[PDB]
Write an enzyme that holds these catalytic residues in place. Structure first.
Site, PDB file in Angstrom:
ATOM      1  N   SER A  49      26.939 -42.168-106.892  1.00  0.00           N
ATOM      2  CA  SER A  49      28.260 -41.570-106.732  1.00  0.00           C
ATOM      3  C   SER A  49      29.267 -42.668-106.334  1.00  0.00           C
ATOM      4  O   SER A  49      29.356 -43.654-107.038  1.00  0.00           O
ATOM      5  CB  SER A  49      28.172 -40.476-105.673  1.00  0.00           C
ATOM      6  OG  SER A  49      29.228 -39.548-105.850  1.00  0.00           O
ATOM      7  N   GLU A  57      26.275 -32.719-113.099  1.00  0.00           N
ATOM      8  CA  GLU A  57      27.034 -33.428-112.082  1.00  0.00           C
ATOM      9  C   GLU A  57      28.137 -32.570-111.462  1.00  0.00           C
ATOM     10  O   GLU A  57      28.363 -32.662-110.257  1.00  0.00           O
ATOM     11  CB  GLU A  57      27.664 -34.697-112.675  1.00  0.00           C
ATOM     12  CG  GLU A  57      26.676 -35.629-113.322  1.00  0.00           C
ATOM     13  CD  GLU A  57      25.989 -36.528-112.309  1.00  0.00           C
ATOM     14  OE1 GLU A  57      26.110 -36.251-111.092  1.00  0.00           O
ATOM     15  OE2 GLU A  57      25.321 -37.508-112.731  1.00  0.00           O
ATOM     16  N   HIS A  83      24.526 -33.134-108.632  1.00  0.00           N
ATOM     17  CA  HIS A  83      25.030 -34.435-108.243  1.00  0.00           C
ATOM     18  C   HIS A  83      24.325 -34.815-106.962  1.00  0.00           C
ATOM     19  O   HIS A  83      24.436 -34.105-105.973  1.00  0.00           O
ATOM     20  CB  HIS A  83      26.507 -34.331-107.952  1.00  0.00           C
ATOM     21  CG  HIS A  83      27.188 -35.648-107.762  1.00  0.00           C
ATOM     22  ND1 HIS A  83      27.215 -36.618-108.745  1.00  0.00           N
ATOM     23  CD2 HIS A  83      27.960 -36.110-106.746  1.00  0.00           C
ATOM     24  CE1 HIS A  83      27.990 -37.614-108.344  1.00  0.00           C
ATOM     25  NE2 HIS A  83      28.456 -37.328-107.139  1.00  0.00           N
TER      26      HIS A  83
HETATM   27  N1  LIG Z   1      38.144 -29.539 -97.973  1.00  0.00           N
HETATM   28  C1  LIG Z   1      37.197 -29.941 -99.083  1.00  0.00           C
HETATM   29  C2  LIG Z   1      36.124 -30.821 -98.431  1.00  0.00           C
HETATM   30  C3  LIG Z   1      34.690 -30.315 -98.697  1.00  0.00           C
HETATM   31  C4  LIG Z   1      33.766 -31.437 -99.232  1.00  0.00           C
HETATM   32  C5  LIG Z   1      32.494 -31.588 -98.376  1.00  0.00           C
HETATM   33  C6  LIG Z   1      31.184 -31.573 -99.212  1.00  0.00           C
HETATM   34  C7  LIG Z   1      30.198 -32.694 -98.801  1.00  0.00           C
HETATM   35  C8  LIG Z   1      29.618 -33.470-100.008  1.00  0.00           C
HETATM   36  N2  LIG Z   1      28.142 -33.630 -99.916  1.00  0.00           N
HETATM   37  C9  LIG Z   1      27.287 -33.817-101.031  1.00  0.00           C
HETATM   38  C10 LIG Z   1      26.998 -35.132-101.518  1.00  0.00           C
HETATM   39  C11 LIG Z   1      26.185 -35.253-102.732  1.00  0.00           C
HETATM   40  N3  LIG Z   1      25.661 -34.159-103.379  1.00  0.00           N
HETATM   41  C12 LIG Z   1      25.884 -32.850-102.869  1.00  0.00           C
HETATM   42  C13 LIG Z   1      25.289 -31.719-103.569  1.00  0.00           C
HETATM   43  C14 LIG Z   1      25.481 -30.419-103.112  1.00  0.00           C
HETATM   44  C15 LIG Z   1      26.266 -30.201-101.942  1.00  0.00           C
HETATM   45  C16 LIG Z   1      26.851 -31.275-101.256  1.00  0.00           C
HETATM   46  C17 LIG Z   1      26.687 -32.649-101.691  1.00  0.00           C
HETATM   47  C18 LIG Z   1      25.838 -36.596-103.404  1.00  0.00           C
HETATM   48  C19 LIG Z   1      26.701 -37.789-102.865  1.00  0.00           C
HETATM   49  C20 LIG Z   1      26.699 -37.727-101.309  1.00  0.00           C
HETATM   50  C21 LIG Z   1      27.433 -36.435-100.831  1.00  0.00           C
END
Ligand SMILES: [NH3+]CCCCCCCCNc1c2c([nH+]c3ccccc13)CCCC2
Ligand SMILES: [NH3+]CCCCCCCCNc1c2c([nH+]c3ccccc13)CCCC2
Ligand SMILES: *[C@@H]1O[C@H](CO)[C@@H](O)[C@H](O)[C@H]1NC(C)=O
Ligand SMILES: *[C@@H]1O[C@H](CO)[C@@H](O)[C@H](O)[C@H]1NC(C)=O
Ligand SMILES: *[C@@H]1O[C@H](CO)[C@@H](O)[C@H](O)[C@H]1NC(C)=O
Ligand SMILES: *[C@@H]1O[C@H](CO)[C@@H](O)[C@H](O)[C@H]1NC(C)=O
Lengths: 528, 528
Positions: B197, B324, B437
């Site tokens: 990523s 993804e 992803h």
């Molecule tokens: N206000 C909007 C903000 C919300 C965003 C927070 C979500 C956290 C992201 N976390 C994730 C990552 C990755 N895959 C996934 C897959 C599924 C759910 C979360 C994540 C792969 C790369 C590392 C981080």
């Protein structure tokens, strides 16, 4: 005698003709307008003055002055479309096939020939109305109309060459049918106009035009619709082409009166010889002199009329062929030829799309190319060829027809849609052209019924199905006899295939590509 | 002792750790930069001052200050990505797993974590380097770097917050690896940087950036590339977002010195609390503070660098997952939710595409919608959902990666491309999200080797294949041991699938859609 009929214009004498070991009468060459010659060239048609005595209606009339195809000299595939009569500006006649014994008040069918508004004849062997008249017991009429500059030179504002006169020729013949078909046993309240290509576009134009609507009951459109990109132009473009025609004949261009006077002094072949020199672009499937959106015949733009329901509401039966575009690429795109499989390279593919969407900018050409290229096999010659073929067909015939049918059905009283995909067992054209523009006609007119023409037994069966659908539809507003051809509806959008196999019903004929051509490309071209 | 190593920065003491019933050493929490606190926040990193005595490297370091996911409190699917350590601005450390007995000069792998440049930790259970270090006999390093405003606030022209410092943090850790990995048995001339990523995007950014190239030998990119639409911004947009951040914290906005001073006086959680409020559009897959095209780290635009071959030429191994985009729609598009099948309506489909291509006009949204709608089944909820999912994935990960790999291969010395599509037997996420992803990571790090984690035997076999491909590639420039993973070439463009089934080789990974996203849409948006 059964061969003599008295009409409101005078007495006319027909001839008896053989058909499938039987006979029927034919009234060939009946005049419906004064000859549009001399100072009359380019003018709206004038009604034929009645005649005393008996009009000899036993032979075919002359064909209107037109450009003649010479790509494949002596090749029947192409000669069958050329005039098979001497050409003449004196060409406004109609032909009537009447069942024997003469009917009392039966269903009437009036055929309007195609030919891109620059060519065509009512006397071609594929338009012989005897098989249909006989087999279905209908009075079959085929009219004629001025084509090329003769029928469509448009200098809007002028009364000497107002434009659309060819359409007016057709209307006049229809006025005649309405006024006299009863004497031939025809029911004037039950006439169906049907045509193919520009003929189909014409049929739709009579549905649109207020001054034509009351003259017929129902309509059939084959491979053509009024909104086709090649079927009309604005008064400006019309004017621009008339002037350019004049500039090609070394005319005085100071006023409409001067231009028209010059054009009227030229011999028919002089205008035909330079007719193609006036198109604004290097193009495929585009013709010089076609109908104009003049504010009279067409009160407003075609699209607004279709949107507001400003048209004749009735039943319509229409459809398209599988490979509408092949013939146009054969005749004008590089890489295609009559005697090879025409596998096309990427470069020729691209120059072919440029030729096919003449009015597009670069962004537009990329859009089309992207939409029709299999990107994981871009150098596949069969694919490039076929992709190019669909492009021509989708843009020029299919998607315009689909847009027309969807707009029409919203206000109409019944729609039947077909997709004709039978490749004839005796086709003389190379296999790569598939089911060619114009080749459903032979089945509509019943040629597979005559053994000498060499069709298979299933093909003859197909022709009878089609003839009976068309006739049953003209007579009742429904092709079905009380396997059902479903009604096309705004909701379901069903249509049928038309070939030798058991009828299959499908839905949304070419939606994917047609959403592209009817909604995306226009919006994209309008923003860039 | 095997747990004591003397480096150019001081002596450090590790700890022994168990792995698959055996053991290896771990040097956790080694500092590579001075703590970027106080007046140091936003500044480029400074090298750690050496220390006398022994640094206790037996426990994980703190994680950098970041936004914490709370959508599914206690749900492992999402908690596994959150920091599992106390957060702190004092977070510039690296972790080293060393095989036992200590190698002499073996292959080195440095992991760079992902998390959209706004989150991430080097200490997550899925990033535990012990299985890979042990199984493949490689010295595994995982670095850390400032994320969010802390790592990417960009006021170009200023030296107090120049931007890209997070990347510089990574470079410094790499400088450290280069200078000291030999004492842990690592071969400094054979280090492979790999990340997923934003980590994958970072890896590609070090390949591009002149000041980073000499610090490593080869590279692996997982679901990310430097040219991703979400991975960089211009200095202007960067400036615009820093100012807007200030405006959210009621800062004085008269000069860079005034803004930065104010931002530096705020507590970590104050900047995190309003971080999302500065995006220019309502969007999905977009992050506030990311790398900037500054003219220093990136001498010119990414595209011109890729076009001119202005980058490190070496071998690279990279790829993408099948779905993804699912996670991003789950978190921000209407109609998607963790506990339903998320069948989406047309309206939600459309509002989802708007959210996905934030920088597009109306013509652009229509183009995308047309490209991803099955027009003969437009109200099919499974189709709308999946179509939306591919859109996010194609636009944000796959097509940008395909564009990078095609440009890279023209000048590189070897490319290996994969498409990871195995949906794990123990996935806790709803089935509609497919191969998510971030979910190839667990296989790259070998979690299927530990029984308690509940993977199938074939999944464990898959993990070993992947671990060995990655390690064999880091060590030699080829994932194959002398079934062959073919080299991706400009001509053939071959790649392999990566799952539990027998390797299948394919060609032109998502060309159709990627010609749309990499050539058509940009050209279309640039003309309207
Ligand atoms: N206000 C909007 C903000 C919300 C965003 C927070 C979500 C956290 C992201 N976390 C994730 C990552 C990755 N895959 C996934 C897959 C599924 C759910 C979360 C994540 C792969 C790369 C590392 C981080
Ligand atoms: N300089 C360019 C002019 C060349 C154009 C002349 C070609 C003549 C067109 N003739 C044809 C028509 C139709 N189908 C076909 C199919 C194949 C070949 C010719 C024709 C169906 C509608 C009637 C006319
Ligand atoms: C009708 O005109 C044609 C044209 O040549 C002629 O051959 C035919 O004999 C004529 N018939 C009559 C009865 O005049
Ligand atoms: C056609 O019109 C008749 C009478 O106006 C109406 O009852 C019938 O439903 C219509 N049929 C269609 C297909 O619209
Ligand atoms: C290293 O520090 C950790 C942190 O609490 C501590 O638990 C451990 O006992 C320390 N080991 C040594 C040898 O100092
Ligand atoms: C990599 O470089 C070597 C030496 O410069 C060359 O011989 C080899 O063919 C290259 N391999 C690839 C895949 O370009």
């Amino acid at each position: 005698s059964e061969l003599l009929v008295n009409t409101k214009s005078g007495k006319v004498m027909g001839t008896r003709v053989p058909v499938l070991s039987s006979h029927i009468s034919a009234f060939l060459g009946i005049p419906f307008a004064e000859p549009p010659v001399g100072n009359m060239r380019f003018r709206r048609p004038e009604p034929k003055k009645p005649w005393s005595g008996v009009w000899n209606a036993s032979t075919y009339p002359n064909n209107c002055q037109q450009y003649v195809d010479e790509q494949f000299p002596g090749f029947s595939g192409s000669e069958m479309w050329n005039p098979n009569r001497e050409m003449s500006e004196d060409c406004l006649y109609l032909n009537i096939w009447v069942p024997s014994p003469r009917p009392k008040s039966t269903t009437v069918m009036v055929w309007i020939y195609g030919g891109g508004f620059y060519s065509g004849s009512s006397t071609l062997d594929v338009y012989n109305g005897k098989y249909l008249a006989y087999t279905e017991e209908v009075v079959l009429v085929s009219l004629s109309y001025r084509v090329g500059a003769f029928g469509f030179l448009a200098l809007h504002g002028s009364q000497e060459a107002p434009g659309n006169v060819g359409l007016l020729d057709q209307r006049m013949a229809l006025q005649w049918v309405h006024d006299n078909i009863q004497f031939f046993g025809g029911d004037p309240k039950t006439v169906t106009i049907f045509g193919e290509s520009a003929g189909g576009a014409s049929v739709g134009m009579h549905i649109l035009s207020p001054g034509s609507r009351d003259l017929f009951r129902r309509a059939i459109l084959q491979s053509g619709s009024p909104n086709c990109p090649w079927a009309s132009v604005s008064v400006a473009e019309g004017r621009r082409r008339a002037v350019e025609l004049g500039r090609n004949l070394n005319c005085n261009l100071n006023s409409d009166e001067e231009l028209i006077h010059c054009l009227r002094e030229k011999k028919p072949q002089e205008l035909i010889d330079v007719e193609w020199n006036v198109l604004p672009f290097d193009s495929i499937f585009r013709f010089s002199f076609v109908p104009v959106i003049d504010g009279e015949f067409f009160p407003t733009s075609l699209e607004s009329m279709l949107n507001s329901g400003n048209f004749k509401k009735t039943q319509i039966l229409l459809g398209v062929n599988k490979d509408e575009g092949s013939f146009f690429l054969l005749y004008g795109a590089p890489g295609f030829s009559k005697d090879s499989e025409s596998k096309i390279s990427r470069e020729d593919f691209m120059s072919g799309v440029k030729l096919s969407v003449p009015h597009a900018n670069d962004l537009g050409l990329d859009a089309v190319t992207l939409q029709y290229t299999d990107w994981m096999d871009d150098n596949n010659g069969i694919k490039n060829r076929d992709g190019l073929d669909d492009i021509v067909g989708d843009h020029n015939v299919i998607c315009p027809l689909m847009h027309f049918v969807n707009k029409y059905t919203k206000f109409g009283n019944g729609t039947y849609l077909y997709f004709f995909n039978h490749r004839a067992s005796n086709l003389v054209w190379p296999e790569w052209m598939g089911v060619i523009h114009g080749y459903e006609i032979e089945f509509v007119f019943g040629l597979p019924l005559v053994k000498e023409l060499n069709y298979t037994a299933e093909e003859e069966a197909l022709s009878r199905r089609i003839m009976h659908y068309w006739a049953t539809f003209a007579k009742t507003g429904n092709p079905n006899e009380p396997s059902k051809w479903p009604l096309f509806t705004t909701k379901e959008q069903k249509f049928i295939d038309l070939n030798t196999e058991p009828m299959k019903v499908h839905q949304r004929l070419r939606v994917q590509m047609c959403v592209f051509w009817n909604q995306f490309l226009p919006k994209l071209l309008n923003a860039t």
